[PDB]
Scaffold this active site. Structure first.
Site, short mmCIF file in Angstrom:
data_model
loop_
_atom_site.label_atom_id
_atom_site.label_comp_id
_atom_site.label_asym_id
_atom_site.label_seq_id
_atom_site.Cartn_x
_atom_site.Cartn_y
_atom_site.Cartn_z
N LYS A 173 -31.91 -11.54 0.86
CA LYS A 173 -31.82 -12.40 -0.36
C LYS A 173 -32.74 -13.57 -0.18
O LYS A 173 -32.76 -14.15 0.91
CB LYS A 173 -30.41 -12.84 -0.63
CG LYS A 173 -29.46 -11.71 -0.93
CD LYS A 173 -29.85 -11.10 -2.31
CE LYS A 173 -28.93 -9.97 -2.56
NZ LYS A 173 -29.21 -9.34 -3.88
N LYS A 187 -28.51 1.05 -10.39
CA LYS A 187 -27.09 0.72 -10.31
C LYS A 187 -26.40 1.31 -11.53
O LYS A 187 -26.72 0.91 -12.67
CB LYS A 187 -26.87 -0.80 -10.40
CG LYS A 187 -27.17 -1.55 -9.14
CD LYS A 187 -27.03 -3.07 -9.29
CE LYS A 187 -27.59 -3.68 -8.03
NZ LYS A 187 -27.45 -5.08 -8.21
C1 LIG Z 1 -25.95 -5.59 -2.09
C2 LIG Z 1 -26.56 -6.62 -3.13
O1 LIG Z 1 -27.38 -7.46 -2.75
N1 LIG Z 1 -26.03 -6.49 -4.36
C3 LIG Z 1 -26.39 -7.16 -5.59
C4 LIG Z 1 -25.91 -8.52 -5.72
C5 LIG Z 1 -24.48 -8.82 -5.71
C6 LIG Z 1 -24.24 -9.79 -4.76
C7 LIG Z 1 -23.02 -10.38 -4.46
C8 LIG Z 1 -21.93 -10.04 -5.15
C9 LIG Z 1 -20.74 -10.70 -4.76
C10 LIG Z 1 -19.59 -10.40 -5.45
C11 LIG Z 1 -19.71 -9.45 -6.49
C12 LIG Z 1 -20.92 -8.79 -6.86
C13 LIG Z 1 -22.10 -9.07 -6.18
C14 LIG Z 1 -23.38 -8.47 -6.51
C15 LIG Z 1 -27.95 -7.08 -5.87
O2 LIG Z 1 -28.56 -6.12 -5.47
O3 LIG Z 1 -28.47 -7.93 -6.55
MG LIG Z 2 -30.73 -6.81 -6.69
#
Ligand SMILES: CC(=O)N[C@@H](Cc1ccc2ccccc2c1)C(=O)O
Ligand SMILES: [Mg+2]
Ligand SMILES: CC(=O)N[C@@H](Cc1ccc2ccccc2c1)C(=O)O
Ligand SMILES: CC(=O)N[C@@H](Cc1ccc2ccccc2c1)C(=O)O
Ligand SMILES: CC(=O)N[C@@H](Cc1ccc2ccccc2c1)C(=O)O
Ligand SMILES: [Mg+2]
Ligand SMILES: [Mg+2]
Ligand SMILES: [Mg+2]
Lengths: 368, 367, 367, 368
Positions: free
Chosen positions: A163, A263
């Site tokens: 991130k 997704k």
């Molecule tokens: C694995 C990854 O980075 N997932 C999402 C972001 C995400 C991140 C954090 C969260 C916390 C609580 C609920 C939903 C969430 C979704 C993304 O790809 O952007």
């Molecule tokens: Mg993402």
């Protein structure tokens, strides 16, 4: 098949470590699950909304409201249903894709269970396990990040995603590359935190050989992504912007995306996710499977979907214990960097009733 | 599912009237059928090749040879198979799409029968019957054409497709419009018979309000179709050129096509046909279901496929008796201009053994 | 200015006649109003959501929830606020534009009242009255439509907009032109009811000289609108697709739009609406003011906005009695085809307490 | 509001050090100020013309002539006026933008003062101070330049802009980078001194990481700027060419500009400057605030305008003492690299009568 009713549950599951993105830090995952009930059997769906509208405009209380007052009643009023018919039955309601995708997932699981058919078979799986990456949050210091990354690499994860946000981009990437070398598969994800005016800063990622930079600009700025691609070397990946198969085709034609994160909730369900995969394949665009911190139910469906042929880069479907000490299904366990595709009917998993009850904070029945 | 073997049958079925396209006149349909056998049960596949390579490079004896010597042995050597895995198991063999599609079709029918699931459900049907057009051949005279067209309209077919070629284009169209009026849904199909140099002649079709002109130029000439579309008013539809979902995406991006005819065998099977439908829908391109004069086995699969949501123009899936006095399955019968989508497991039909034996000219078991 | 709190009220107002669009028929308007309270005084905001998510994803109960749990608490936590700062204070919440715009509207009305400055002055009015059209719904029969249209023309409305959908497009247009002639300003609005595959049907509107066709395709299909514009003669206008000034710039660059309908709530408020007007003017794209069946509070703000210089086509801001027997403010009354721009501080109108209490179904204080 | 008359003043203010651009050296600033008089109160405007037509075709005596004989009379004849109505009332007169913008500024200041509303509030400010750069002229030697730059950096200016011209481009830039390093924010400004044929020389700036090169070619050569952008790495910024919001949209669509300098007088006033900011924002183009060596009156308005949200790079609005020993208003004083946004009604400042009289060389009243 007639839908008799749905039991909607609110579930709360503490994370093993807090997870920080450009839109904030979360230490507990709150989610909605759906148990669809038909005369022939049950099915499970999971919604990928969060508590507040920070990732997209949808969020738990809103998805619950729309499911209860519009979407579920529309399916209950229908004489006959199938998962493919969920889309036209709900088309009159605009948006609410995550909510619609959760309901579709439940209906599909119920339909497939009745035919003794797995999600994998329905979706067109061509392999029995998939290679998995991990997504790593923003940390307070570089040494903490390097310890977390080295831990995941020791567990056998095949790819690292970081991130990023203003103030945490070039330095963490540089440090990771210095500690772990050039051969680690590495990519970054901004969750919409930059503007086109930040192009010079993002171009500073050019020498680190990243596979991609995921969603640097806002959801609606497709043309801006195509302009950014002309100024940076790191290939552009889109997440939030890809809301449908048509949106993927559009973004591809405009030069706005080289690699697509799929997704299923974000696009309105597993059936549209498959159409996204097929549209991208037909244009030579690689896809990978995204993750919204799902329980084993969503994880199981996602591992199935990630076994389709154009999923040629490692996904974010990490093992259950990346997020949760105790999952509500039998857990997904990494083995040689891979997760196995589920094999029974439907999702191939179902909640362990005792474990589900422990994390259920409320439930409501929506019947005719 | 382990494949135990496949029976290949050659079948010959006389047509109720000879059918003339720009590539010639056929009075009998010769086809290959496949019966795939698994420990669960059986499934039926049908190949859309003709006797000779006049429509595309594939033809019956060729498809039979490649199935027997390459494709069926590749599936027999595999540990486990599913219809979705047929494609990668056969990907090392180039081309041969109609043959691969027939084999996939048999596999898919066996697999779906074992789960008690129809083709319609697996493909994503959204409706239980479909509106059907008819394809009418080139005739020796205009009065004959007008009698044949009036006959089909009296049966309730919702759209008329005319085969055309140099010397038989503007006049038959003009006559049909004069006799039957401007409200009839009308389109034409050249089966590759023109070149870009015929653009002025094809522009003469402009005042007749045709829905489309289907494959006016050769299969490989995608750029030429895009140049033609800039010179004529009738929308371009592609059939022979659309050999895959990728080929559909390419043709669309190049401006070569506004409407797409989907034939499952031509694209390598029902699973790729769905992907063609989905790629076209994502680009806003309407599709309709093509026909290769199939028995009730292929017709059944096609009616199912034609019930998907982006099939928004009437298909060529006519009733069984447009072609055959006696079909080998329970026949498809038009009702209010529509055919019903089959409901049982798999294709929802299977051959009536006595009728099948009667039209079978050869068979062989590949185990 | 420190925000002390906001009252949210739910209001229900029966329409003088049911209004049918491609997304259904509505006989009552249910809306949310906001009263923002500051130590200076008060300001009024109006949300343009409907009861259900049929026009866009936002709807009354949803907007009320997000205002109560996210948006109003964010403004209450801020030290100082101004209407211009509402946007960054709420930028972390994705979407919810109609809700944000309503809240901005209340804030702006309170702020402008404190400086004794009208909406018109703040937005950059250049004229003191505006020419008004009317939007006419789908009817059960063509004679009814012609009676309703003649009635509005007799009241002096300067332009007629017809709602259209599949089965109600070419015929109602043809009939209106036959009855009322070629000099009437006429346009149509599909509210997303068509696809690119309906282009031939929409091309049949070509001989009627329509000013525009408004939002023929879905909200997200910007590229599809640009492809449609290459196939039909009627100019394309966008409503639902124009969610921001950036979205207007994108649509313009892509060739997707020649004329833009501006609805302040749809874009996230009156300040972004001005920016939409300015971006369109810089590209030579005419705008006109949309209408969401607002009370006199929103109508007042809209008449002000519609007096800006690039509003060069008549808007949908009809007189109050096109919709409501009794408005909650002093009513807007057409005069020579125009409505007058309000002159006092803020909106220039405020609710008559007795009339407001009468149509109020619920209220809550968020402090 | 009726405009009763305008008092037009010619003002002369010596600079603390001579300022050299590609079009010459100036050691005194001569300018026109306007005091608009209405029954409700006064307002101040400032014209950004210079003595001769070296920067653009407008100059002090010409702007004075057109104001006296065309523009002011047109506003005096109007029954009612507002600042927004100044544009259509003056539209029949072609060009003369700086003159028109000065008159608009006075009218706006009078209107806003009457409502007790600041320029900042009217324009849409989102912050209470702005980061400021400085513009540095051409010097006779490199050591003088390096001393001047190091002085400004010690005062806390956040960005350095160098005037350039043939014979003074690559060497001064190289020397600045050698003395002060790669992290200083640095950019250059040619004031139209090059042609497309100089592209090879301008490409020699590529390795120095400049933020931008401002107006390398002539005002009317928009297409030429787009061709130059294809041959050099330094991003193109336009000043003289951006005469309106439509001109900004045009230049953006043609690929002629990545970053825009907004000067309100140049575009015909503060209201059009805001429209420039909004058009650029809608296309993802950053803007910054330009400076014409204004007194505190113009400086105050410019600091307000620079506090809008798309002003994401530091502007040329330096402290008053960068130019003037004694300003005619209370002076703008740098504090931590920033200037504070004014807060009272209108501009938030007004001339100190004694200081204004000292620098006023002539005045004339234009009444009905
Ligand atoms: C694995 C990854 O980075 N997932 C999402 C972001 C995400 C991140 C954090 C969260 C916390 C609580 C609920 C939903 C969430 C979704 C993304 O790809 O952007
Ligand atoms: Mg993402
Ligand atoms: C219904 C229609 O026009 N079918 C094909 C062509 C076709 C025509 C004739 C055939 C005769 C014998 C065997 C196969 C054939 C295929 C087409 O659309 O181009
Ligand atoms: C004047 C006009 O056509 N308005 C909207 C649609 C609209 C139509 C009907 C409504 C009924 C109840 C509540 C909100 C509504 C909004 C439009 O331009 O698309
Ligand atoms: C801060 C800066 O570089 N300003 C102008 C040029 C400028 C330069 C010198 C001037 C001298 C007397 C009057 C007006 C002037 C304008 C520019 O950006 O191009
Ligand atoms: Mg054909
Ligand atoms: Mg509309
Ligand atoms: Mg300059």
């Amino acid at each position: 098949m007639k839908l008799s009713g749905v039991e909607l549950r609110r579930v709360q599951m503490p994370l093993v470590a807090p997870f920080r993105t450009s839109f904030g830090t979360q230490s507990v995952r709150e989610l909605l699950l759906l148990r669809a009930v038909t005369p022939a059997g049950e099915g499970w769906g999971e919604c990928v909304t969060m508590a507040g509208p920070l990732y997209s405009s949808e969020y738990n209380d809103g998805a619950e409201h729309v499911l209860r007052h519009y979407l579920i009643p529309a399916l209950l009023a229908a004489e006959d249903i199938t998962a493919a018919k969920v889309t036209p039955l709900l088309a009159k309601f605009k948006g609410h894709r995550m909510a619609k995708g959760a309901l579709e997932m439940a209906v599909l699981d119920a339909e497939l269970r009745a035919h003794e058919r797995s999600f994998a078979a329905e979706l067109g799986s061509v392999r029995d396990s998939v290679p998995c990456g991990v997504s790593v949050g923003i940390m307070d210091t570089i040494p903490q990040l390097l310890d977390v990354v080295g831990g995941y690499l020791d567990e056998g994860y095949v790819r690292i995603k970081l991130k990023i946000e203003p103030g945490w981009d070039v330095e963490p990437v540089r440090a990771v590359r210095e500690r772990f070398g050039d051969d680690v598969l590495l990519q970054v994800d901004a969750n919409t935190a930059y503007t086109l005016g930040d192009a010079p800063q993002l171009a500073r990622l050019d020498p680190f050989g990243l596979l991609l930079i995921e969603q640097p600009l806002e959801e609606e700025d497709v043309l801006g992504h195509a302009e950014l691609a002309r100024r940076i070397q790191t290939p552009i990946c889109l997440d939030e912007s890809i809301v449908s198969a048509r949106a993927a085709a559009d973004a591809i034609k405009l030069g706005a995306v080289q690699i697509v994160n799929i997704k299923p909730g974000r696009v309105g369900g597993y059936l549209e996710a498959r159409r996204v995969h097929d549209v991208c394949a037909a244009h030579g665009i690689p896809v990978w499977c995204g993750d919204m911190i799902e329980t084993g139910l969503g994880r199981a469906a996602n591992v199935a979907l990630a076994s389709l042929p154009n999923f040629t880069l490692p996904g974010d479907t990490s093992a259950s214990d990346r997020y949760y000490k105790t999952d509500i299904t039998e857990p997904f366990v990494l083995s040689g960097g891979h997760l196995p595709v589920p094999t029974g009917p439907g999702l191939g998993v179902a909640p362990i009733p005792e474990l589900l009850d422990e994390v259920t904070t409320a439930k409501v029945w929506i019947g005719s």
